[PDB]
Design a protein around this nucleic acid. Structure first.
Ligand SMILES: [K+]
Ligand SMILES: [Mg+2]
Ligand SMILES: [Mg+2]
Ligand SMILES: [Mg+2]
Ligand SMILES: [Mg+2]
Lengths: 51, 129, 413, 51, 56, 69, 61
RNA sequence: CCUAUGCAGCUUUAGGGCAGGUUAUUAUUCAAUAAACUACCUUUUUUCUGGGACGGACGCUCUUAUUAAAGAAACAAGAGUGAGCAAUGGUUUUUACUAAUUAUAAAAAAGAAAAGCUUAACUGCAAUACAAACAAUUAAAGCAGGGGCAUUGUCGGCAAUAAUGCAUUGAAGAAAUA
């Protein structure tokens, strides 16, 4: 689950670091009306793992 | 301001004449809080609009002025009379308001008379005390 | 009633205060209001021609004090800020050096003022300290702009205040009066043509007596705020009143207390004023002013950048954070700086011994891009000094200096 | 487009159903995701994100 | 008096009145009564914040 | 729709895919409180006025009416 | 809560349905113990059905 | 004289409006609302037609002449209709019966009447054809569910050919969202 501001940070992180701006913060939770649509709240810098 | 002019140009030809006559009386009365109101009519069965003017009810009263020790005839609307009573009377209304807000020759002349008289009496009283 | 009707009542809102734009005044108060709120010289000239005989002392004073505001500068000498609106001490534009008035407004202002000066003399003995201060301030503005060359009534205004050991001020003095008197006199002695020798002596003598007897001895500085105190400091600096430092310390204390209210255009003035007076022992005062540039970086103009750097070099006050702000701002405004102005700015950095990578890198790139460079002797040595003092090395500054030398040798007057 | 007065096109009923908001998403097929990985344009040894 | 539309006003009494009240009492009276009799005669003043502090 | 009528619509630029348009406010995480508007009922009445109506539903243009005076 | 109430109402109605069906069928059957037309030996069975069924239904209504 | 995307003036108990006066109600010390009377403003007042007016007509069925395929017009001709039925619908049994409709050579494993039980005058779909500018209109094998009468057949209303009205707007029952 990403918000409008969060999606920008995910896609173009350099657009914030080049201007020395902090990255957008992630959302706290989604509205209950969307239960069954999302599994986790996205983190603006994703945590990569091995596969 | 732009909207006000746009509305005025949509008035009926006879309502425009009445509007000009109302405005020409500004210098002869104590304008005070008098405002202009426009009547608009709409209908359910057609897309037609009629614009007309709402008249102002003028009242002739005699208010007491302690500085001048006189009952001054005045032409007022109800809203202006209510404001004057609330603020503390004619003397307080004229001494608590700048010349810019009066927007009337009759009001300005009356205010100037009161201000000059108040200073003369105050100066004499201050010297006495 | 087959066709149902709905009725709406619309009220036409109007401004609370009347602008005396079209109606003719018919009273003592109305005439004063129309003159004060006049928008154009044609309106003021019309009022004087029609209601000439219905004038009093107050009416003449008001007309003179408002005339400077009706004279507008050329649009080519003004640069508009992005989104800035009129406010307390902030304008939507900044002025280029030595701005000129509009071509078609000078003859109107000169003609109108001549008529006013003719009828004023009879009213000279009915003026108050407030009225005298405003007249002095107005004339100083009218001299900075190319309207007048001297104040005919300067001798009378100064005498009126000086009489009876400043008795008039002792009862009717406020913070504004001192700010306007000193600021007005400074602009009457430096702006435009330099001065007359007798005029300079009288003005400087009066200012020294006024400052010591009123502001210092009687403690009237308690009536001054940060802005008024800053204005006095600027006036003293232009008059080179370096002998008395007691008042300077008092004024600096007032500025320190109300530092938050000053804008970047006011902080730069304080730096320059202190630099001209040579007062460099107030390090604490300098530190407080430097802290005011952190948040108001959007209200800085090339004039503020140039004044701040030059003042710091003269004062010897080196703040890394403040210098960093000036360098970064200047790097983007290189197109606004003149060739002479940009040479002084570079020299200022060299004297301080600060090497700003972005600032010098931008300058070198611009110079190299220029195919034909023509550097004048007046500032050729300044740019060379800045590179040498700033420690710029063979990377690309030797090429820039090489072109500088070649251009200078190309003329060798 | 005028038909002479019959006005046959406006003799049909009107529907007001709202389509799902998910028609605003970008659609990615699983078969297309694999093709990129096989060609070498995607790293399948670590977590794949929308970035 | 707020919704009286000017018909009712707050009055501060400077001298004892037969029916309105006593000196120093703040009461509500008809607008016409104050306009014509109480105010011009000099027996009362309008209940402004300044008058209330000074007299009431 | 009949072939003759369908080609005219396509020739004019008709390309609608759904009965109505999607609502961007319904996408999770993209709700703007400022741009809030209660859902309205679509109007099914064609504008058949021959003076200011649709040119495709009238044979020729008619003169406008007089304003009240 | 609304769904639970609606389900409860339907369940109650279906429970009473068998009795309603029995009354529906019974009300339209001829009771030959109350027929005097046969004693008259004048009308046919169809005419007897209409005469007595209609009276019973109207009285119940 | 007739024909127009016609124009203008005039009239009225043709439609709508209130914007002057009068009148009615209400409110403040020259005001607000109006199914009324006068004045004023704005809008409407089909087509077919052996020229136009006057008269008549405008949907949907049957029949006559233009032969024995279908189709085919005129202000040609001769007759119907804007419904009815809780059985006059569905389905079994019996037999000294074989009619009637606005009109008509329908029909014997068919109908009508008599006797009994019933609600298929259903829910969700449908190959393929008749017709037809289009919109709509007509016939229909077959599949799944729940039923009726029979006991393995039929029933998705009525011998057949007329008993009708797009979209919009409004209203009701239920359900899903927000
Ligand atoms: K003929
Ligand atoms: Mg015709
Ligand atoms: Mg078809
Ligand atoms: Mg069966
Ligand atoms: Mg059947």
């Amino acid at each position: 689950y990403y918000t409008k501001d969060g999606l920008e940070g995910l896609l173009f992180p350099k657009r914030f670091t080049d201007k020395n701006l902090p990255l957008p913060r992630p959302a706290v939770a989604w509205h209950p009306k969307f239960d069954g649509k999302f599994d986790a709240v996205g983190q603006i810098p994703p945590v990569y793992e091995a596969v | 301001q732009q909207k006000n002019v746009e509305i005025a140009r949509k008035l009926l030809p006879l309502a425009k004449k009445q509007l000009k006559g109302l405005l020409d009386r500004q210098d002869n009365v104590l304008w005070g809080k008098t405002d202009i109101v426009i009547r608009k009519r709409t209908f359910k069965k057609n897309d037609e609009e009629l614009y007309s003017l709402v008249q102002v009810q003028w009242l002739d009263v005699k208010l007491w002025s302690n500085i001048l020790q006189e009952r001054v005839p005045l032409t007022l609307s109800q809203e202006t009379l209510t404001h004057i009573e609330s603020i503390g009377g004619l003397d307080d209304y004229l001494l608590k308001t700048p010349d810019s807000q009066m927007k009337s020759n009759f009001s300005s002349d009356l205010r100037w008379r009161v201000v000059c008289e108040a200073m003369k009496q105050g100066e004499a009283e201050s010297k006495q005390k | 009633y087959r066709n149902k009707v709905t009725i709406e009542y619309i009220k036409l809102k109007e401004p609370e205060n009347d602008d005396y734009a079209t109606r003719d005044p018919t009273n003592y108060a109305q005439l004063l209001g129309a003159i004060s709120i006049s928008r154009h010289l044609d309106r003021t000239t019309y009022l004087y021609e029609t209601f000439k005989d219905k004038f009093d002392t107050i009416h003449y004073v008001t007309a003179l004090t408002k005339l400077p505001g009706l004279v507008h500068y050329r649009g080519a000498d003004l640069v508009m800020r992005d989104g800035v609106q009129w406010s307390e001490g902030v304008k939507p534009f900044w002025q280029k050096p030595n701005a000129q008035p509009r071509k078609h407004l000078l003859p109107k202002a000169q003609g109108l003022l001549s008529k006013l000066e003719e009828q004023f003399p009879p009213h000279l003995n009915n003026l108050f300290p407030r009225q005298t201060a405003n007249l002095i301030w107005a004339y100083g503005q009218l001299k900075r702009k190319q309207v007048v060359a001297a104040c005919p009534f300067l001798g009378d205004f100064l005498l009126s205040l000086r009489r009876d050991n400043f008795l008039a001020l002792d009862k009717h003095a406020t913070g504004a009066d001192y700010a306007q008197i000193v600021k007005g006199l400074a602009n009457l002695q430096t702006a435009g043509s330099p001065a007359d020798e007798d005029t300079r002596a009288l003005i400087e003598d009066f200012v020294d007596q006024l400052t010591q007897e009123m502001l210092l001895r009687r403690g009237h500085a308690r009536l001054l705020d940060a802005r008024e105190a800053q204005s006095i400091l600027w006036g003293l600096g232009k008059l080179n009143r370096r002998k008395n430092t007691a008042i300077i310390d008092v004024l600096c204390d007032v500025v320190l207390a109300g530092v938050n209210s000053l804008t970047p255009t006011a902080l730069a003035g304080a730096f320059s004023a202190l630099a001209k007076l040579g007062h460099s022992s107030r390090t604490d005062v300098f530190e407080a002013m430097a802290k005011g540039y952190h948040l108001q970086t959007t209200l800085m103009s090339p004039q503020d950048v140039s004044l701040t750097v030059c003042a710091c070099a003269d004062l010897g006050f080196r703040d890394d954070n403040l210098l960093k702000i000036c360098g970064l701002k200047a790097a983007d405004m290189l197109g606004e700086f003149s060739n002479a102005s940009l040479a002084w700015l570079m020299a200022g950095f060299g004297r301080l011994g600060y090497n700003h990578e972005a600032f010098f890198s931008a300058v070198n790139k611009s110079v190299l891009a220029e195919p034909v460079v023509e550097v004048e002797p007046g500032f050729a040595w300044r740019v060379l000094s800045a590179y040498a003092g700033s420690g710029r090395k063979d990377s690309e500054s030797l090429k820039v200096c090489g072109r500088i030398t070649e251009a200078f040798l190309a003329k060798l007057y | 487009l005028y038909d002479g007065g019959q006005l046959g096109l406006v003799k049909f009923p009107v529907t007001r159903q709202i389509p799902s908001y998910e028609v605003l998403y970008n659609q990615l097929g699983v078969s297309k995701l694999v093709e990129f990985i096989q060609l070498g344009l995607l790293d399948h040894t670590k977590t794949i994100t929308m970035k | 008096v707020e919704e009286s539309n000017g018909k009712l006003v707050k009055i501060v009494l400077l001298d004892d009145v037969d029916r309105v009240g006593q000196q120093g009492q703040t009461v509500v009276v008809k607008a016409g009564l104050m306009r014509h009799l109480l105010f011009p005669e000099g027996k009362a003043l309008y209940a402004t914040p300044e008058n209330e502090a000074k007299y009431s | 729709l009949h072939k003759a009528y369908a080609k005219k619509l396509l020739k004019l630029g008709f390309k609608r895919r759904f009965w109505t348009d999607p609502d961007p406010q319904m996408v999770p995480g993209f709700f703007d409180p400022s741009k809030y508007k209660p859902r309205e009922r679509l109007n099914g009445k064609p504008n058949l006025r021959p003076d200011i109506g649709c040119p495709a539903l009238r044979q020729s243009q008619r003169p406008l009416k007089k304003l009240p005076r | 809560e609304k769904r639970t109430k609606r389900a409860k109402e339907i369940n109650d109605a279906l429970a009473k349905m068998p009795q309603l069906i029995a009354d529906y069928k019974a009300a339209r059957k001829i009771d030959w113990a109350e027929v005097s037309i046969i004693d008259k030996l004048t009308l046919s069975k169809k005419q007897i059905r209409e005469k007595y069924v209609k009276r019973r239904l109207m009285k119940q209504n």
